[PDB]
Amino acid sequence: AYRTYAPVGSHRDLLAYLVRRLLENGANSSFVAQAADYRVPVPALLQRPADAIVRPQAAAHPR
Amino acid sequence: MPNIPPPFTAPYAPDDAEIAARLLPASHLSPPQEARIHRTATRLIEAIRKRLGGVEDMLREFALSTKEGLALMVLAEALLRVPDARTADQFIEDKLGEGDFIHHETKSTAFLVNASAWARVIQPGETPDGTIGRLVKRLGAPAVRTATRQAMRLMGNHFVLGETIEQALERGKPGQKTRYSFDMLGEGARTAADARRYFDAYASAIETIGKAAGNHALPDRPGISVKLSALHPRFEAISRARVMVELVPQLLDLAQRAKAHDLNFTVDAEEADRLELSLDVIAATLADPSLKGWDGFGLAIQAYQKRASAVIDYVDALARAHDRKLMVRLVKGAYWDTEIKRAQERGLDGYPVFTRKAMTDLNYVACASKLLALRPRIFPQFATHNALTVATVLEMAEGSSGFEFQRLHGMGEALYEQLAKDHADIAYRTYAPVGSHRDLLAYLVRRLLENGANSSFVAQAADYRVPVPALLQRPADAIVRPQAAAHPRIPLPCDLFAPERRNSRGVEFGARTALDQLLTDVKAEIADATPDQAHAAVAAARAGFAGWSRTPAGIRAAALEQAAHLLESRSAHFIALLQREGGKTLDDALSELREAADFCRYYAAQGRKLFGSETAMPGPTGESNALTMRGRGVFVAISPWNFPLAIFLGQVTAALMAGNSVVAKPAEQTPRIAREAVALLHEAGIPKSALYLVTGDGRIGAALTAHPDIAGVVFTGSTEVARSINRALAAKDGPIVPLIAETGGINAMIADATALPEQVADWVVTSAFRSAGQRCSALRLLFVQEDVADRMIEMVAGAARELKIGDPSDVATHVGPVIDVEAKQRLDAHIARMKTEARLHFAGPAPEGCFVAPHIFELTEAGQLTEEVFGPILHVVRYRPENLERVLRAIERTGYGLTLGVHSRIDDSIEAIIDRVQVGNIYVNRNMIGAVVGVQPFGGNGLSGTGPKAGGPHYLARFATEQTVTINTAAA
Amino acid sequence: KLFGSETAMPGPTGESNALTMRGRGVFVAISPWNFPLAIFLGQVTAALMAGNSVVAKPAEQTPRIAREAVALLHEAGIPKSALYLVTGDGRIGAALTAHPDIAGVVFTGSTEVARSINRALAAKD
Amino acid sequence: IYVNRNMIGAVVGVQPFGGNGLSGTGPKAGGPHYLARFATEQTVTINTAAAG
Ligand SMILES: Cc1cc2nc3c(=O)[nH]c(=O)nc-3n(C[C@H](O)[C@H](O)[C@H](O)COP(=O)(O)OP(=O)(O)OC[C@H]3O[C@@H](n4cnc5c(N)ncnc54)[C@H](O)[C@@H]3O)c2cc1C
């Protein structure tokens, strides 16, 4: 099963919603953006999260 | 009425800065000129960025390498020629991307030369290998199918193709006129039969295009593009005499057929080393009276060449002298990467082309300016898909008449549509690629490099990350200053190894002044020892060892570098010797002279690193530990007849550099070059007490190697003699001394169906028959996939028939004599045997004298070749793709392991072959010969040699011995 | 340092040239009694590190230490197929070094035996 | 060569140990030229021009 949601509302509420929505479809880390970028190989999209962290002390972002 | 111009001979590679010094000021344009250009160009680009586009869009859309684009277009063409479209659709959905990745790639490429080859059950879980498998792993199978369908629309819309020229021509048919001129696919005939085929294709194209030319006058009639390399199988400067006599009547015949339909007839421009020869051919053809009263004859001129402006002058003078009107095509140039690589390999003193893109763009505009001023006698054709270039040429014409633009079908469409909307009197010619499947691969490769190139205008305009203003930067603003004309990150060939060492100088045979001077300089240019004299030589070398070993490494290195300088200073003398005593052709002699000097400079540089200072070892406090390398003693150097200067000097200078004294015994056939080399080393700084020459037979060689006082042997030659040397050394009761032995090989090459047959054929001919096959690295055994075997074999045979066999001092000679009568007898005996044992594909005609001509035999199996045969004799085995393991085993079985060639588009196949074999030198997609010092460390294993590799970083240490000095420093 | 990566050679644009170092084949390692562990292991791990498989013949006086060392190497990650211990006399040592399929010999011991080994190697075709 | 200390107990990677003449062939055990002797060189040359 999957549920599909449609955004529903008035024009006066669109801008606030569009802003929040666009940050994600534009983000480089976003899966959706990457899967649409054919420079990114399928195997790279399948890296396990644990293999990217490797070690507890690396949990926080270094920068 | 004016004089026919002298043969074209502009300087090949002048300095970029001097050219930029004239081009930069002259490119200046007033503000209103720049404003018109800016507006026109902005409008063209806006139109470009508005359909279903080109190759560039496909490469960008799927982020494809050029190799991947190539594989898909090849697969696309094969799928377009399946009789039933539903069959293709079924294949695409159900087979493609599911598996059989390499099979699909191999078959679709084989289809291009052998249509019957292309017409299973795919097991699941197949590892994705090959170009298509790797593509599938990266993008997924559905995207690959989608990319293949797009390649199919590109192949179907932008190329006019068939199995034969008749099928292509029928397909490209419009009582209408063709809206396209024909860019014919063919180039580089490898055989006489290819040259006739291309001739007939051009002739057929001209009738088809004539029957549909419409009723207007030039320039509003179709054109055909022609390549001189397609019309003659040895189209090269050294074969000029035969080219002038053979090619001209063919080119004339086609020009006449074209004139009869009042067509535009254009001779394409090819590599820089063919410029002069082509201008010779073109001039002699144009001179014929049968071409009067026709304004369509012409040629392409490449602005990326420094010589372009001079070519324009030459062409104008040609036109005035014969009172003709010419249509002249200005292009930038399609061979840039090739010109860079060739100038580097050939050790030229510069590049014939500019190395900054903006310099080409500058020179193009300057040349367009020049061409426009030669109207109306010259009708300029500006072939470019650059919107800025178009806008700039348009401004400078100040009108729209007396010239045209040109483009290739599938490129520049939106640009030129928009140009025509904004300027209704503008003419542009559109060319369609037309030809046979067997000529597609060579053309696709050249085409794809451009649509893939990052600097390419077309690629950039299709990349929306690149702002319109960036596409409109003026070329002069990118260069700024003359001294910035050359590309900062591309060294001149003489600096290719800087700062490690200098590169030897070569000569461009395609520059007649350079070749004539070399031929002139060259034309202007021994008792055995008793066994007692050999023993006295060892003893004298033993005495000189103490002082030579203690001479500082920098001093020893300086002598090698001075020897290199003297060799290059006296190259003509040494080349003459190599030709007369060695029997070598001019290119082989020059190459050997370069290699000799490269050995000196390389061992000198490695010598300083290795012997120049001690290595400090880590250790406890209060103690020092230093490792040094000292000369061993007296080395005996035994050298062969086939590289009687370079291998002679390589072995000798290595031993000397390590701090050994040397007794050198050259091959019996070549003592004169050995004696000159030794005198040169002495003159360069090698003391008489450190180097002695002893000449004579194997008895003399055995006297040297049996001597109890020698510290090592360096040997290049026969396998049997190496073992006898090894046994004589092992028999002594003294020290076990090093033996460095380089011996022969039965060198193989593997070619699959993804390899371009014309290219393989070139590389096979070179590798097997160059130097009459008297190189240790020479191809002896070709393995070729059965699907392309007939075509590959026929092409190698046809190419081998074009080789001139004869006197090595004649410039036109390709194959000189074998070294002596005994060599010829052994070769002729192997030939007689193979004739009764194996299929004969080619047996060339030898001149009277000590000559053996190229022979080609096909063996039922590799095991029929049991000996190294040191001559121009190729053996071929055809194999089935699934039986590659049998091929690899066959190669392993000989026990040799010197060189191996691999020809394939498929990286997984190449890598699998490299992983499997233990061969010393592997050459992928090029010839198997001419190892370059310090670039290809050369040497084999198994029956082929002991190591270490000559011309590599492990060689010098073998000639030396280690010493550790440990000092208790605690008292300090 | 040596086998971990290929060495890129200078050369022309449009061409790559890489130098690698590969195992030769089967090495015969012959070791003395006086350093029956360290010289035994020095010679063996050197050959193995270079990517050769090894047949090791220790001195007749000291096989127990050799067998323990070989067993330790196996446990450390050397596959059984890459390393074998053969014990015995000089005659067994001579059988190993006369074998036509071996790719090299590393030997520590007497001068006379080295020469006999060297002659046996040179005698092969 | 050992200066002002004993002549024995060569340390691996500190005193690369081995002789010449009747004493040995080289290269020295425990030194930087040893491993190469156990190996064979291979040169791989690839014409990369078709790629760019
Ligand atoms: C129907 C629906 C309803 C939703 N309702 C809500 C809601 O009520 N409240 C709400 O907050 N979200 C909500 N979301 C989630 C939000 O809208 C995004 O869609 C979601 O976070 C994307 O995750 P993913 O698995 O699609 O994509 P991915 O590309 O896998 O994941 C992206 C997410 O990773 C996280 N992230 C990115 N960078 C970093 C970083 N450097 N460090 C740590 N985390 C990082 C962010 O949460 C980001 O959204 C909803 C989504 C859907 C589809």
Ligand SMILES: Cc1cc2nc3c(=O)[nH]c(=O)nc-3n(C[C@H](O)[C@H](O)[C@H](O)COP(=O)(O)OP(=O)(O)OC[C@H]3O[C@@H](n4cnc5c(N)ncnc54)[C@H](O)[C@@H]3O)c2cc1C
């Ligand atoms: C109909 C037609 C016929 C042609 N016939 C021929 C022919 O007979 N012979 C031939 O050689 N060419 C020929 N060409 C040219 C070649 O095919 C390319 O199409 C052309 O060079 C592209 O130039 P441009 O103005 O389209 O593109 P751009 O993107 O403006 O220019 C690219 C060009 O710049 C040059 N270049 C790239 N990098 C550098 C650099 N670092 N330093 C210096 N220069 C650089 C190259 O020549 C390259 O092709 C022909 C082109 C057409 C359309």
